[PDB]
Write a protein that binds this ligand. Sequence first.
Ligand code: CLA
Ligand code: CLA
Ligand code: CLA
Ligand SMILES: C=Cc1c(C)c2cc3nc(c4c5[nH]c(cc6nc(cc1[nH]2)C(C)=C6CC)c(C)c5C(=O)[C@@H]4C(=O)OC)[C@@H](CCC(=O)OC/C=C(\C)CCC[C@H](C)CCC[C@H](C)CCCC(C)C)[C@@H]3C
Ligand SMILES: CCCCCCCCCCCCCCCC(=O)O[C@H](COC(=O)CCCCCCCCCCCC)CO[C@@H]1O[C@@H](CO)[C@H](O)[C@H](O)[C@@H]1O
Ligand SMILES: CC1=C(/C=C/C(C)=C/C=C/C(C)=C/C=C/C=C(C)/C=C/C=C(C)/C=C/C2=C(C)CCCC2(C)C)C(C)(C)CCC1
Ligand SMILES: CC1=C(/C=C/C(C)=C/C=C/C(C)=C/C=C/C=C(C)/C=C/C=C(C)/C=C/C2=C(C)CCCC2(C)C)C(C)(C)CCC1
Ligand SMILES: CCCCCCCCCCCCO[C@@H]1O[C@H](CO)[C@@H](O[C@H]2O[C@H](CO)[C@@H](O)[C@H](O)[C@H]2O)[C@H](O)[C@H]1O
Ligand SMILES: [Fe+2]
Lengths: 82, 137, 30, 35, 447, 340, 335
Amino acid sequence: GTTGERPFSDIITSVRYWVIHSITIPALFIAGWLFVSTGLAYDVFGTPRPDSYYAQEQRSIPLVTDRFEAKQQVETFLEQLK
Amino acid sequence: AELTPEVLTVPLNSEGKTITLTEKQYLEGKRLFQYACASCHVGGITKTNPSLDLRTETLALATPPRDNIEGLVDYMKNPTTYDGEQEIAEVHPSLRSADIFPKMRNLTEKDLVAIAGHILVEPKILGDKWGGGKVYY
Amino acid sequence: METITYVFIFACIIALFFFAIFFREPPRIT
Amino acid sequence: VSYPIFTVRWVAVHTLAVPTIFFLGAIAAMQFIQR
Amino acid sequence: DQESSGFAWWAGNARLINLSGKLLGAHVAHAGLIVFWAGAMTLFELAHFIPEKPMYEQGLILIPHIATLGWGVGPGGEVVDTFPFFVVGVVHLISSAVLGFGGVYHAIRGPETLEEYSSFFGYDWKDKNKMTTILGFHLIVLGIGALLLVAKAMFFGGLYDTWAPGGGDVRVITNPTLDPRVIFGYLLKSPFGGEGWIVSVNNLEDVVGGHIWIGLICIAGGIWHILTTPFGWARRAFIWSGEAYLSYSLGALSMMGFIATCFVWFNNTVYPSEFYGPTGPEASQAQAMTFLIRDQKLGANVGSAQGPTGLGKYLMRSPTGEIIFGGETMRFWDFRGPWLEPLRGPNGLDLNKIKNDIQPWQERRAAEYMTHAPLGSLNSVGGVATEINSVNFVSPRSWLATSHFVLAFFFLVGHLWHAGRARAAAAGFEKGIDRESEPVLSMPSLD
Amino acid sequence: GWFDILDDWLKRDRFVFVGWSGILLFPCAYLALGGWLTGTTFVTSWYTHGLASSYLEGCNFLTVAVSTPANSMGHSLLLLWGPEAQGDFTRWCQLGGLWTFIALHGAFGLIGFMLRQFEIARLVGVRPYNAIAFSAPIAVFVSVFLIYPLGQSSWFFAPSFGVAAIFRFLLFFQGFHNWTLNPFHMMGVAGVLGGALLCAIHGATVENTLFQDGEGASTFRAFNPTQAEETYSMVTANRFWSQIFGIAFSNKRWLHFFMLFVPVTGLWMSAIGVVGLALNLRSYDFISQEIRAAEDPEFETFYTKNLLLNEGIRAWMAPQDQPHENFVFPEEVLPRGNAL
Amino acid sequence: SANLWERFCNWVTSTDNRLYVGWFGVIMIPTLLAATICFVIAFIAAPPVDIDGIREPVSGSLLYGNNIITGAVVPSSNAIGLHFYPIWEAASLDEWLYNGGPYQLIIFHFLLGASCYMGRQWELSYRLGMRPWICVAYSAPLASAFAVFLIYPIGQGSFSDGMPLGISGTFNFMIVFQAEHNILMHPFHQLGVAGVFGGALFCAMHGSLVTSSLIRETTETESANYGYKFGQEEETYNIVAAHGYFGRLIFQYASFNNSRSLHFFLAAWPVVGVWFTALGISTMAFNLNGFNFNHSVIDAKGNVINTWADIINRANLGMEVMHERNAHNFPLDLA
Ligand code: CLA
Ligand code: CLA
Ligand code: CLA
Ligand SMILES: C=Cc1c(C)c2cc3nc(c4c5[nH]c(cc6nc(cc1[nH]2)C(C)=C6CC)c(C)c5C(=O)[C@@H]4C(=O)OC)[C@@H](CCC(=O)OC/C=C(\C)CCC[C@H](C)CCC[C@H](C)CCCC(C)C)[C@@H]3C
Ligand SMILES: CCCCCCCCCCCCCCCC(=O)O[C@H](COC(=O)CCCCCCCCCCCC)CO[C@@H]1O[C@@H](CO)[C@H](O)[C@H](O)[C@@H]1O
Ligand SMILES: CC1=C(/C=C/C(C)=C/C=C/C(C)=C/C=C/C=C(C)/C=C/C=C(C)/C=C/C2=C(C)CCCC2(C)C)C(C)(C)CCC1
Ligand SMILES: CC1=C(/C=C/C(C)=C/C=C/C(C)=C/C=C/C=C(C)/C=C/C=C(C)/C=C/C2=C(C)CCCC2(C)C)C(C)(C)CCC1
Ligand SMILES: CCCCCCCCCCCCO[C@@H]1O[C@H](CO)[C@@H](O[C@H]2O[C@H](CO)[C@@H](O)[C@H](O)[C@H]2O)[C@H](O)[C@H]1O
Ligand SMILES: [Fe+2]
């Protein structure tokens, strides 16, 4: 039925398209690759680096045990991590 | 930065010396352990004789003492019962029996050191896990 | 007393099967 | 025809396209994180 | 070809139902992918194969086949010489170029119809005879192939023999089982527990004799067909259509596909277990062997030992009375294997033997098998589902039996699909009910 | 007055329709699928539970998830700017904020999408038996991801948005609620399972009853997307089945309504059931059986058998599955069969 | 006459017999009546059956302490295994019952008839000049009934294993299967779920949409159903108004408009998907189990970090351990 606006088949085939994207796509790919590569991701999402789960001993898991004072608790958890 | 060279220091002889195996040996020890051990000693137990395990305390009460490199090493060369009464090289893989346990043929004095050094470091990392199973998985 | 109650509802499904097949309203062409 | 270059659909097709590749790149980067 | 003229793109290859020339190239080119594989993979195996480490512990499935024929093995399947492997692998890899050349050629350059290009090679589906002819040839070709095996056994090196009197080792069969009785017996032997079916066959004399007894039947047929045409019933029985011919041959494969999945999962003879892993029942047996030994060799009196239920840990009886191994293994009391037989007596596992005739070679062989049972995950992690990582391994016996049941099955589905289509394309209505004359519309209602 | 100018804009037949409903459906929907995809690859479930839940940690597609918040959190909404997170986004990620975020956004997202079905339907002028049908899934998600937990201790016990993180939710149920023995789940199955049968028996009946309206074999083209005569023969069908199963349809209008009722109804019963397990008002046991087995030790039914499996599932699982409970079960306590 | 056989073959093949007995049906009919009748009796009255190998008889029948939910026909004994145990192989019915004889009789018969039932589902189509393949859609369920009742046992070595004929023992088969194969973690089951879950999803869609575009031909006070007449000439709803909406819900091309292409996707999705689960049970029958990620994600020192895959396994062990409490004498469950 009613077929409106710029078509994909064409756009994908358009030389202008790849001119534009054979910069943008890999750009994003390398942009994110560095997000992990730099170790930025870790710090953004408080996710532990392979060497940061338990300090040398503490075979005990750092489990948040109470809301309200939840954060302060997590902080000290990273603290202990020396 | 967790598997420190301190966690890699295990008793060398029975008198007291210690050896600080490298992270290179460790890995290779593990590779060699799965290569000729895991089949029957996965997780540090014993599929064909659950009574005896590879827990360090266990090896200590062995005879001769196996809670050190030289001891385990002797074993892989010529195994004996937990009391040392019988030589069991004919039913347990060893150098004295490579003709029957091929995998053993590759193995060299160097390899034997790693495999052994692995049997002593694991429990240092895994703790109770290394000894029992199921219950501890 | 339960056995009986279960076997009944069952005997009913089975008689209801007969009727639903051999005693439906024939689907006449219109 | 004289189709436009920036449409509502383009806004959509990109909100999922841009993040994805960003991720596929990040995720492809992890494959080398070890020990 | 085109759709608006032939079939549909995803149905492409049916556009060739009537273009034998191309339909030959299709068949040739493909019959090249199989060889190519056989070849390319054997080298992939070999390139990884480690001379002295159990084959089953190395994901091999092709080399094991070559070994069983008696090629580069020696005593106990010792992998004495790798060359036969390299040798076999490549020959195929090359013969693939040949066949490959034919296909590409016959489906492109060559004539796309054997019609006039050669009236002997050309063929007619409904020609209820040129088919009986082509079949005939092939029926002879297979026969020559079967006889090749007998050759490799009775004349060139022999085959592997787990049952080898001295013990597993290559052995030249020189007493093929002749005689219909024994041979054909296996044919009408229940497929159920105990009396297996074809999957019994515990000795190479029969495997060999049985094959000798095949060409001298298979070729006997290859002739009878190049010399005749389907009788009356034959014609008023089957649908003579290209697609229909496929169907019958489809179900055929599928049916065998199961017969195979069963063979590699149960038989010990034509699948050494020294090259493949141990049979499933074999491993469940060896765990008892392993503990009946360990405990005996420790003070226990296995003959009298009574377990949690009152059945006796190590030994109990079977429904027919035989003394078997206890535990869940009571179900595998049918397992027969080299390492175990010497402990068997006339009423089953004998006590005296068990009590003091258990050579070390068994104690460790029994241990080897219980620690190499057919259990593992998709990502190849040997053992029970609850097991921890390390020791990645999956018995060839698993991989094989698993793959083939899938193939085997889908083919049965395939069979129906075509047998059902060709059986209606004939009456001619595989494209829809004829608006104008709906059979149903002329049948007395049931109400 | 401009309302209309807007309404006009929104209701314009674009590639991807929008609508007033879209002013909700998209802000959320995306924002939810987005959070999942994020948490799935970047954030962890270490402070909340005690496991790696993302890619960056080493998990694969099957083992990843946006795992619920700590039990000590409670039924807290976990608003990024609330008492807990205290505005700090990263910590928010660590305490499990990403869960209530996905849960709640996805929630309004399903509300949005239904309004859509209701907006597009009103426009295009068709009956709304597709927004009605979609109530079935609202029930499931609204009772399994929202009601259930609200009935228990915290959010920690809701499914977790993960492939395995769900298989776990399955076993837990079998083990603590003995779900499979609940008449409501049973109906649930009878409906999903038979809704599949309808969706496959009907599909096959249509395709193998087609009149010929083409010349080739690929009869897909023979169907004129344009009106006219039925494409298959309802009369022939009704005949087939009636002689090969005794009963058979004969009212396309009823057939297609049944197809809506069956799978929809079953997911509803499925829901009511869980609303019950929120209060642990489960269908765990049959007392008549217990009393008998207590007195007579030789009475065994597949019923009792399964009850022991549960004892096992709870004993061995509980510990690592409910960390905030600091369970410690000495090897001598662990219920076990023989040998194993 | 004209030789009754000639005639017989015409009745057997009658295209207008209330219920189409066919050539396949000549077997389906007695086979299913033997099974169905033995099942119904077995389920009502029938002594406890020594399912596992031991001598710890389980009672499944009603007259022996069960209700419809707990009752079942118990699998032939483990002492029997894969051996063929018909009634004539028993020394007495009692032996036959105590050892589970009823099961084998019931499944071998149901599998035989259910197969011919598949064949019959072709014969009639042929006799009615309709296209075949319906019988191929039904090969999914059958394949699943085959897996669970015949393939799984041939692999494990005994009919004692292999889903028991009863509501609760079906749950048993599952809860245990999991612990033994970690099925939930096997591609083939996930495809099974996408199929069964998907199938339903689409059954609601198709049924939904169509109902949503029926052409007004009835008052407000009378069923919408009357608007259709059996065998009526043309279509009964606007397949274009249908697509007109669904297309706009997601987006035009992300929709159907070809009844034939739409209806095929309906019969292919669940069938292809359900086939797989049958191939999963049939596959895990030879011990190629689900994925295993236990003790992956290990940290820097070597500490195991546990992923959801482990909480899973933790609950699986609990199953592995307690199941068949008195049937094990050695460490490994290799049967
Ligand atoms: C024994 C060999 C065999 C042969 C020679 C044929 C031959 C034929 N088939 Mg049959 N078929 C077979 C087995 C066989 N089939 C089986 C076992 C099944 C059951 C699945 C089918 C199901 C089947 C159907 C449903 C149809 C045919 C059709 C046809 C005809 C056209 C071919 C075609 O459409 O190609 C085109 C092929 C493709 C579109 C590509 C193959 C696609 C499959 C699904 C991929 C499988 C690949 C691989 C295993 C998986 C990848 C890995 C995965 C993990 C991602 C042709 C006469 C068609 C016909 O017109 O019937 C008369 C038709 O519609 N066949
Ligand atoms: C591998 C198995 C296989 C084989 C042997 C064939 C064979 C054939 N196909 Mg089928 N096909 C297959 C799979 C296969 N197909 C699948 C999976 C599909 C679904 C996508 C189809 C779909 C399909 C359609 C839709 C059509 C065919 C047609 C044909 C026939 C004509 C070939 C042609 O037109 O080439 C066209 C030529 C080319 C563009 C060249 C392709 C490159 C060559 C052949 C490969 C070279 C191979 C290798 C790299 C080099 C080796 C060289 C060395 C020996 C020196 C031919 C008999 C046609 C037909 O029926 O004709 C009437 C047709 O219309 N096929
Ligand atoms: C390569 C395989 C092969 C193939 C495809 C054929 C094919 C054919 N043969 Mg040939 N045949 C072969 C090998 C082969 N034969 C061999 C090796 C010999 C020995 C020399 C013969 C001897 C032979 C003779 C003597 C005759 C034929 C005839 C025929 C034709 C029709 C007969 C028929 O199929 O009845 C199908 C069978 C039945 C209707 C009987 C069904 C009842 C039996 C007892 C039960 C079978 C059950 C089975 C054991 C269980 C598994 C079933 C499964 C579904 C679960 C047919 C073209 C006939 C013909 O027309 O002559 C040219 C004929 O008279 N053949
Ligand atoms: C098995 C799972 C299952 C899934 C995944 C599913 C999915 C879907 N069903 C839809 C529709 C339907 N489903 C229907 C009946 C059913 N659907 C069923 C089962 C499912 N239905 C069942 C059993 C039935 C009964 C038969 C009907 C009747 C319809 C429709 O009309 C509609 C459709 O258009 O059909 C195709 C689509 C609605 C899109 C949407 O709401 O966007 C808005 C919401 C978005 C984008 C946010 C996601 C919201 C949720 C709460 C968050 C989940 C969080 C993460 C994103 C993902 C979780 C990750 C996993 C690993 C656990 C969607 C593709
Ligand atoms: C002990 C365990 C119990 C097991 C229970 C099993 C239940 C499964 C039955 C299937 C449910 C019917 C769903 C379709 C509804 C329908 O459409 O069938 C209706 C008859 O319904 C009924 O009352 C059906 C009664 C159940 C018949 C059982 C079949 C037995 C199999 C025999 C095997 C032969 C070898 C009537 O048809 C309708 O009649 C009209 C409705 O206004 C319209 O014509 C419709 O289009 C349609 O034709
Ligand atoms: C028709 C057709 C088709 C098909 C095709 C085919 C089927 C093909 C095939 C092909 C083939 C089948 C090929 C083959 C080839 C081969 C080769 C080319 C080989 C080579 C070899 C070599 C060279 C060897 C040697 C060696 C050694 C000894 C050692 C070292 C290494 C090496 C390897 C080097 C298609 C689908 C596309 C499309 C349509 C059409
Ligand atoms: C959270 C959050 C947020 C946001 C965010 C977002 C919105 C995001 C997004 C994101 C995204 C949006 C992402 C994506 C990603 C993706 C990916 C990563 C993908 C992948 C894929 C793949 C890998 C595929 C594959 C495949 C399949 C599945 C099948 C078929 C075949 C193939 C192979 C192709 C905010 C700030 C508000 C706040 C806070 C929170
Ligand atoms: C097409 C229909 C097919 C039906 C097939 C079965 C036909 C036979 C139906 C028999 C119906 C009655 O079946 C009979 O019910 C009574 C209860 O009322 C049961 O009796 C049960 O309750 C009484 C107390 O009230 C107890 O003392 C007894 O121990 C207990 O078993 C019988 O054990 C059962 O055999
Ligand atoms: Fe429909």
